[PDB]
Short mmCIF file of C-alpha atoms and ligand atoms in Angstrom, two decimals:
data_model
loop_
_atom_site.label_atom_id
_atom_site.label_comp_id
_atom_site.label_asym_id
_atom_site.label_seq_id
_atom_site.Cartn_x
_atom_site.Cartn_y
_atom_site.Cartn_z
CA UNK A 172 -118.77 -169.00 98.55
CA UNK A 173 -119.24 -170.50 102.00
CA UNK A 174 -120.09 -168.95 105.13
CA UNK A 175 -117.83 -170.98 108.44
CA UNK A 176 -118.56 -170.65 112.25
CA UNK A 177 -115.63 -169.89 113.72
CA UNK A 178 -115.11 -173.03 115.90
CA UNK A 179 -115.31 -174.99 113.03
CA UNK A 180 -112.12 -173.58 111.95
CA UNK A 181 -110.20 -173.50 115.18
CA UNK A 182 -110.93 -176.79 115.81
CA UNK A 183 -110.16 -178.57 112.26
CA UNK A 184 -106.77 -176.65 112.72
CA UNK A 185 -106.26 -177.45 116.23
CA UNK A 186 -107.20 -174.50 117.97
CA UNK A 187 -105.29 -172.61 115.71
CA UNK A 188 -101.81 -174.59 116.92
CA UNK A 189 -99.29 -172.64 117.12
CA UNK A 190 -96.25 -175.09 116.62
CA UNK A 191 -95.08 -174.96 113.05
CA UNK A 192 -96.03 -177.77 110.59
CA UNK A 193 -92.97 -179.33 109.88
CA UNK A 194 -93.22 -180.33 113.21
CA UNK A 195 -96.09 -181.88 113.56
CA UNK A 196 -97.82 -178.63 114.29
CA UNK A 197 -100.48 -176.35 112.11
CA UNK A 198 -99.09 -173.00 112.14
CA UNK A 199 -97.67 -172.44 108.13
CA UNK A 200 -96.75 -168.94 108.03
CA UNK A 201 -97.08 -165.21 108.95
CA UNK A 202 -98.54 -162.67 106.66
CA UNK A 203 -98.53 -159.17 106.61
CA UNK A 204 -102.19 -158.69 107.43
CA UNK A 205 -102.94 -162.01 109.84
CA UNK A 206 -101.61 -165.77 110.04
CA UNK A 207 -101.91 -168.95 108.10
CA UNK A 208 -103.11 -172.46 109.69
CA UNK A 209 -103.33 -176.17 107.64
CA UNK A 210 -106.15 -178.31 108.05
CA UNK A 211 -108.48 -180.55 106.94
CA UNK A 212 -111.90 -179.65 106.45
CA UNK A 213 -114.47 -183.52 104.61
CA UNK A 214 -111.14 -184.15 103.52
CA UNK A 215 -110.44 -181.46 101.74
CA UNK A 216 -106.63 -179.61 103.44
CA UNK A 217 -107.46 -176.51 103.69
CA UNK A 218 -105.47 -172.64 104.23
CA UNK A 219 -107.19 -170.48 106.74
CA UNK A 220 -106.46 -167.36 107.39
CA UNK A 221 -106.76 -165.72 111.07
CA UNK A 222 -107.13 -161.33 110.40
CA UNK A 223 -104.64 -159.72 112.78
CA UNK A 224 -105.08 -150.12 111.41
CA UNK A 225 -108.51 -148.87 111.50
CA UNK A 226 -111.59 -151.26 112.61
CA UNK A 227 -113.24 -150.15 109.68
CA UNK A 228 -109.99 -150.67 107.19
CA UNK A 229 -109.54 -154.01 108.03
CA UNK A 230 -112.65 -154.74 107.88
CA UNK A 231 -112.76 -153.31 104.25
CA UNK A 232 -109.80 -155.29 103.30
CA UNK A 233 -111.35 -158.50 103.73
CA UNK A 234 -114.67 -157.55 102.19
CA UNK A 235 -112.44 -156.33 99.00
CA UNK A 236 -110.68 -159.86 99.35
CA UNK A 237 -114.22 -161.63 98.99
CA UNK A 238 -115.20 -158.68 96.01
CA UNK A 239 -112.20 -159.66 93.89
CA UNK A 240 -112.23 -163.63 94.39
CA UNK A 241 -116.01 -163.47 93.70
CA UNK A 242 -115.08 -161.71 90.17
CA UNK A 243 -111.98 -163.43 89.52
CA UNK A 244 -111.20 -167.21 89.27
CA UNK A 245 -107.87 -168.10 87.46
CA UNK A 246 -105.46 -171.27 87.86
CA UNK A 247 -102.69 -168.58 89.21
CA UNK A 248 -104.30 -166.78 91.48
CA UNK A 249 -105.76 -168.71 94.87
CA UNK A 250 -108.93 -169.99 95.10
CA UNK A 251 -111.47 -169.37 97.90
CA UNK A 252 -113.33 -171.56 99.34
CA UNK A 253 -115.27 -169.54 101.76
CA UNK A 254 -115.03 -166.86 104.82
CA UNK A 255 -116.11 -166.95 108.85
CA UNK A 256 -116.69 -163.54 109.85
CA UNK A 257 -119.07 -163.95 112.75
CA UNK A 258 -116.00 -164.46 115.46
CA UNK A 259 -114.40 -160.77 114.29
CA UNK A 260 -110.78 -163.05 114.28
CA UNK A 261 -112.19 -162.58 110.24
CA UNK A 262 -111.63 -165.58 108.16
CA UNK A 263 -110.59 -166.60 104.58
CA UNK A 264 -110.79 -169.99 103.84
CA UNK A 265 -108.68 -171.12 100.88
CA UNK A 266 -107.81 -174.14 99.03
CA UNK A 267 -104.37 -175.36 100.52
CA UNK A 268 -101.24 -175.14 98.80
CA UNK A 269 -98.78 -177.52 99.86
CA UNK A 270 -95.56 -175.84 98.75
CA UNK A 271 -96.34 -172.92 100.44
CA UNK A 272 -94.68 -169.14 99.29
CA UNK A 273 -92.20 -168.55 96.30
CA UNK A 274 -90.32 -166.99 99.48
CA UNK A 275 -89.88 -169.61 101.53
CA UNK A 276 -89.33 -172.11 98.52
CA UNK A 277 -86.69 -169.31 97.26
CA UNK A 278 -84.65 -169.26 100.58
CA UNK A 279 -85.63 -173.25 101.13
CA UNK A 280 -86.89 -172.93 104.51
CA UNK A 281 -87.20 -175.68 106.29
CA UNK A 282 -84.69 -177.35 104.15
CA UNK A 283 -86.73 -178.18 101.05
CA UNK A 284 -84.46 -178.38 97.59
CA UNK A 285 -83.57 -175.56 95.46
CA UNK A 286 -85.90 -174.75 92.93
CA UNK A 287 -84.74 -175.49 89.09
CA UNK A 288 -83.75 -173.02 87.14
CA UNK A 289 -86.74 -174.36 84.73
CA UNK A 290 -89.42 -174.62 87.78
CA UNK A 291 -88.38 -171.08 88.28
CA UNK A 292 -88.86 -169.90 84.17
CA UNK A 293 -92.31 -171.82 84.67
CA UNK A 294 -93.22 -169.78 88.43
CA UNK A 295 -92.48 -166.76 86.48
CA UNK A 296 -94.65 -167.36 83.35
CA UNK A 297 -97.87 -168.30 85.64
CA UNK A 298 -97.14 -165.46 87.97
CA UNK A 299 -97.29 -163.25 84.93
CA UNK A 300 -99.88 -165.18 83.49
CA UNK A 301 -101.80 -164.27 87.28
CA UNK A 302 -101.35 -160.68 87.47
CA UNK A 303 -101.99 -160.18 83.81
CA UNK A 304 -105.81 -161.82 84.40
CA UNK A 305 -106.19 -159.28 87.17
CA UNK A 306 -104.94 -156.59 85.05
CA UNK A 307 -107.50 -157.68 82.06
CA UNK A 308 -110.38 -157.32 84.98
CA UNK A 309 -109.20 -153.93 85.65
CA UNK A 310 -107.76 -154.68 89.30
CA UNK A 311 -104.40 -153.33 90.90
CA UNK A 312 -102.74 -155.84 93.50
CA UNK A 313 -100.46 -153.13 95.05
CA UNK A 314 -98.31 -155.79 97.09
CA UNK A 315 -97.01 -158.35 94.72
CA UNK A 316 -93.88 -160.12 96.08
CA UNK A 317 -92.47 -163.14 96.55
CA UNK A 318 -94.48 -163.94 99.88
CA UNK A 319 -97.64 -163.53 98.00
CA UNK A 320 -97.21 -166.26 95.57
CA UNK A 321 -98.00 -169.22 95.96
CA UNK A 322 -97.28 -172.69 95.52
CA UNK A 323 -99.06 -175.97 94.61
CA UNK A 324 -97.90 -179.71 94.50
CA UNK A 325 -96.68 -178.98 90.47
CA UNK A 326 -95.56 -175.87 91.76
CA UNK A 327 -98.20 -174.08 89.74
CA UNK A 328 -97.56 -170.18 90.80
CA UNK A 329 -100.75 -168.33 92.31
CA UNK A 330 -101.03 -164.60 93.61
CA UNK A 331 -102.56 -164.00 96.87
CA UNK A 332 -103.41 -161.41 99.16
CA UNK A 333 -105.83 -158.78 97.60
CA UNK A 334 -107.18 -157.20 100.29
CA UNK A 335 -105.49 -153.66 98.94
CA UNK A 336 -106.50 -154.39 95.25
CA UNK A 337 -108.13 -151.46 93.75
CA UNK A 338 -109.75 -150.95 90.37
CA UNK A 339 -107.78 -149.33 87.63
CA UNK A 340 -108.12 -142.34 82.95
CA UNK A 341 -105.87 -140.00 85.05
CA UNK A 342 -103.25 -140.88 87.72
CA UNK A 343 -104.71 -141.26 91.17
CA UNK A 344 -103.32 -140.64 94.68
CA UNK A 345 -103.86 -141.80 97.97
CA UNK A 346 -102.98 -140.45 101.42
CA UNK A 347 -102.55 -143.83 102.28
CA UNK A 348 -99.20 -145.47 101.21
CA UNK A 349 -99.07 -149.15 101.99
CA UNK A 350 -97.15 -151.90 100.69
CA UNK A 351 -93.69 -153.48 100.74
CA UNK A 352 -91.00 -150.76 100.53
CA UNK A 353 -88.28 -153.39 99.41
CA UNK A 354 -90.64 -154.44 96.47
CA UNK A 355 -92.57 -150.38 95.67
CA UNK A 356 -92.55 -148.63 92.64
CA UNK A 357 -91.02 -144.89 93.03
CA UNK A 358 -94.65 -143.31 92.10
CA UNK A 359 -96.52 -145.95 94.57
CA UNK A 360 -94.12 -144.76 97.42
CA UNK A 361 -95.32 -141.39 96.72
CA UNK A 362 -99.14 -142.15 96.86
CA UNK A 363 -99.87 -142.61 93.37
CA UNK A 364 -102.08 -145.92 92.05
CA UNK A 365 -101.40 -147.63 88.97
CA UNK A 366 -101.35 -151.08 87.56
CA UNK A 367 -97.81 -149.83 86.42
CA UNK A 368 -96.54 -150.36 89.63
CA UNK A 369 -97.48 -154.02 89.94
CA UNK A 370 -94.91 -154.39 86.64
CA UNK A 371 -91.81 -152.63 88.93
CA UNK A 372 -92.92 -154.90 92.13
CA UNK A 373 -93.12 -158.07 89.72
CA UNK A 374 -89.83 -157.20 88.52
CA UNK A 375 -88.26 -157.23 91.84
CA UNK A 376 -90.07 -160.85 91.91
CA UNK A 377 -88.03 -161.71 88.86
CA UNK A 378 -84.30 -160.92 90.87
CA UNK A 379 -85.42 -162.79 93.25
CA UNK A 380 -86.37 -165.48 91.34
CA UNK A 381 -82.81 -165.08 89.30
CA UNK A 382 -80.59 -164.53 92.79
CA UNK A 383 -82.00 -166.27 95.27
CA UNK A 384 -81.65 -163.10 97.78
CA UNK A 385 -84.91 -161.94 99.61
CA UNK A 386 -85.63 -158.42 98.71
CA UNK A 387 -84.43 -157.05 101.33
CA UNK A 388 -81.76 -158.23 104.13
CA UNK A 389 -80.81 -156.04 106.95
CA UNK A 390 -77.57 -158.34 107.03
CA UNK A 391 -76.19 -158.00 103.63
CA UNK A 392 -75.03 -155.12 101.39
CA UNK A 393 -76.56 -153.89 100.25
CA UNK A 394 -79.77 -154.17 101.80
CA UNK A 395 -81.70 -153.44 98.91
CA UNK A 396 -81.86 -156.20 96.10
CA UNK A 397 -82.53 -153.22 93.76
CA UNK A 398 -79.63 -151.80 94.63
CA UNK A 399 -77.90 -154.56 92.27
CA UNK A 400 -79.46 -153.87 89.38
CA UNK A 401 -77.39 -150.33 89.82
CA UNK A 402 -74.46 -152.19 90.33
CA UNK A 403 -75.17 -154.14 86.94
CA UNK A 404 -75.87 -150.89 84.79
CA UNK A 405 -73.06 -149.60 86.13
CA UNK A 406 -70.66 -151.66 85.23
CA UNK A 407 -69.52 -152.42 88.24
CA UNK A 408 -71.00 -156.30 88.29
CA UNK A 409 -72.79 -158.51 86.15
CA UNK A 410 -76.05 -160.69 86.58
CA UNK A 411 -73.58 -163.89 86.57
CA UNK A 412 -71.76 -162.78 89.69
CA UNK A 413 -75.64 -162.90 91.66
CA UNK A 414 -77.13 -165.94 89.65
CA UNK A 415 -78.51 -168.12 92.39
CA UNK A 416 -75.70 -171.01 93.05
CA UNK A 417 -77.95 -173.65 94.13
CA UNK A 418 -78.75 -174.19 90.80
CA UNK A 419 -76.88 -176.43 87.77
CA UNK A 420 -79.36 -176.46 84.94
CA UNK A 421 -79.01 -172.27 84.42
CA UNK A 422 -77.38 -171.29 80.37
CA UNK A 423 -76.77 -168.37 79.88
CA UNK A 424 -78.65 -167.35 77.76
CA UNK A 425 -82.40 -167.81 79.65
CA UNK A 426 -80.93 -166.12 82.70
CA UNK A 427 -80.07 -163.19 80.74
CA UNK A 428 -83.46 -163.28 78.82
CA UNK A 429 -85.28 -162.94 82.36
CA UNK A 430 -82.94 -160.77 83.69
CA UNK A 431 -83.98 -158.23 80.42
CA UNK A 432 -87.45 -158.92 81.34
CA UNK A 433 -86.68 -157.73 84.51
CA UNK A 434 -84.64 -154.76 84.01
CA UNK A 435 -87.11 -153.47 81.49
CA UNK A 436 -89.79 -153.71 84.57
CA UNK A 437 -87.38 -151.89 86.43
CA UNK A 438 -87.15 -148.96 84.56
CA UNK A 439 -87.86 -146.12 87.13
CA UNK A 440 -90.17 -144.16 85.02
CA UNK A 441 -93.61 -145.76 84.63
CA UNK A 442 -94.39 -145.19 81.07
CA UNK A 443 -91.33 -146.82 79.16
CA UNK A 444 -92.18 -150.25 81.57
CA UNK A 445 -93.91 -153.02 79.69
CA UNK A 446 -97.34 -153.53 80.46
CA UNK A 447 -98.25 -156.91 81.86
CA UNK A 448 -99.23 -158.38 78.61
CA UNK A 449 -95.95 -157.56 77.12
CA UNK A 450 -94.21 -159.30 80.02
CA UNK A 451 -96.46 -162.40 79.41
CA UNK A 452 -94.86 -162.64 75.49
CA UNK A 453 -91.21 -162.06 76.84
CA UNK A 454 -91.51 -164.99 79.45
CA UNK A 455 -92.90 -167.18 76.68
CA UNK A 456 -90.43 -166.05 73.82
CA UNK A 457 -87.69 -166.43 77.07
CA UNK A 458 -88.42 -170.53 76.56
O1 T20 B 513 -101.64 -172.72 101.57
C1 T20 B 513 -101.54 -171.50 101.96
N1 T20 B 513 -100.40 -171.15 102.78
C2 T20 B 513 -99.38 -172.16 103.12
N2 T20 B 513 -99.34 -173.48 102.83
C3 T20 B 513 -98.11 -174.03 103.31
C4 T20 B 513 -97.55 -175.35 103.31
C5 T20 B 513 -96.27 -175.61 103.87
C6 T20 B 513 -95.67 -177.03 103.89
N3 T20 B 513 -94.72 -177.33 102.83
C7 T20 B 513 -94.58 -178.77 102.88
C8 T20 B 513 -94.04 -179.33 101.62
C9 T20 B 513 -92.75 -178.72 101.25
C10 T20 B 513 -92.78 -177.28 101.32
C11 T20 B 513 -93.40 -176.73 102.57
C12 T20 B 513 -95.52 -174.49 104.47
C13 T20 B 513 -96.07 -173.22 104.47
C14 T20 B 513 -97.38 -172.96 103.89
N4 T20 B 513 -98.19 -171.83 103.74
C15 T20 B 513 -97.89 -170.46 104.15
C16 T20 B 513 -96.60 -169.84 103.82
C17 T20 B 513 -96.37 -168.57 104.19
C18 T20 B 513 -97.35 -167.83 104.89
C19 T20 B 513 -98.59 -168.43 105.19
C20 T20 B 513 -98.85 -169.75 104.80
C21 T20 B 513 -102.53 -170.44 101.54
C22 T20 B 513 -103.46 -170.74 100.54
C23 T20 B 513 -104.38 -169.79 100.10
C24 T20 B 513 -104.35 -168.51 100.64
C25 T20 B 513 -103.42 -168.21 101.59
N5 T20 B 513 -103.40 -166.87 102.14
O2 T20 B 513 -102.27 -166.39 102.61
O3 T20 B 513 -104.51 -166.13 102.14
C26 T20 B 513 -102.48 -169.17 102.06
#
């Protein structure tokens, strides 16, 4: 890893420029935990990543950021390229990916096309194939969703954001819930810890992927996009009434297949889920 001065940074990505990218500008995105600038660093374009409770926690965060990317280097999960601490605006320096988040490709932001129904089987499989390598290393993401994957040129799926990972014996609690409510397990609302719980969020990923509808929406009903999946066991609707419309090249038969996948991920007790391994075979068998 690489160690950055902080002006290096700022200035590369134009003193951190606020006006979006599609507009000339640098700014790519908001996350949850600071914001996103392009740039190009000896030619390579670059993600960099400006921090934004405790002094100590956040701190702790990013050091656990650096811990797991030191220990784990996988084609679907990000790649860093190096850090710049010494400003305390803490930086992550990434390799840049040009399609930017499954969420913003889902809802097309900034008018970009709809994904395929077969670029989305493909986002699925890697993202599985991503979470299932962190699983195998015996690390818990605890906030996968749809704005922490990734996208490349190929649209290649990567998971980001690690900075609450934990390692993964009996069931653990925390006094400190944190997450995504729209995307938590029941159990990791309540304060438990479990890789389990990465299998319900991912599953939430997988409606998303299926619908097209953000997780949550404060202007729809319902809110929840969980709250459909009741509506589906119930009898009440089917997946074809939600199957994303901006999409022609969706049988059947695959959407069904992923929507099983999902359900089974959904399943609000977190022994009868499949563990992530098991998800990886359905998503392959699925094609
Ligand atoms: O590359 C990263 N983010 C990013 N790239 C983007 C490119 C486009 C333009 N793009 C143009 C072509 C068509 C589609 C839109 C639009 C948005 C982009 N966003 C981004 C999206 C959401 C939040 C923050 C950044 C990144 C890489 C590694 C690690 C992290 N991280 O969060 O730690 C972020």
């Amino acid at each position: 890893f690489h160690s950055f001065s902080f002006y290096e940074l700022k200035n590369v990505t134009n003193n951190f420029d606020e006006r979006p990218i599609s507009v000339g500008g640098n700014k790519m995105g908001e996350g949850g935990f600071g914001v996103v600038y392009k740039g190009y660093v000896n030619n390579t374009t670059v993600a960099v990543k400006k921090l934004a409770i405790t002094t100590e926690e956040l701190k702790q965060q990013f050091d656990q950021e650096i811990k797991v990317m030191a220990k784990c280097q996988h084609e679907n999960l990000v790649e860093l390229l190096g850090f710049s601490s010494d400003g305390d605006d803490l930086c992550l320096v990434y390799v840049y990916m040009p399609n930017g988040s499954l969420l913003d490709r889902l809802s097309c932001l900034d008018g970009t096309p709809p994904l395929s129904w077969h670029m989305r089987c493909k986002i699925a499989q890697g993202a599985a194939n991503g979470i299932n390598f962190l699983h195998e290393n015996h690390h818990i993401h605890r906030d996968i969703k749809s704005a922490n994957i990734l996208l490349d040129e190929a649209f290649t799926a990567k998971i980001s954001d690690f900075g609450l990972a934990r390692a993964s014996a009996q069931t653990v609690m925390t006094s400190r819930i944190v997450g995504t409510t729209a995307y938590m397990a029941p159990e990791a609302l309540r304060g438990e810890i479990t890789p389990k719980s990465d299998i319900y969020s991912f599953g939430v990923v997988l409606l998303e992927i299926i619908t097209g509808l953000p997780a949550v929406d404060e202007h729809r009903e319902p809110q929840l996009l969980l709250d459909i999946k009741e509506e589906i066991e119930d009898e009440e609707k089917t997946i074809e009434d939600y199957i994303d419309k901006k999409m022609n090249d969706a049988d059947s038969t695959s959407v069904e297949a992923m929507y099983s996948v999902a359900s089974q991920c959904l399943h609000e007790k977190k022994n009868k889920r499949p563990d992530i391994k098991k998800v990886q075979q359905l998503l392959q068998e699925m094609t």
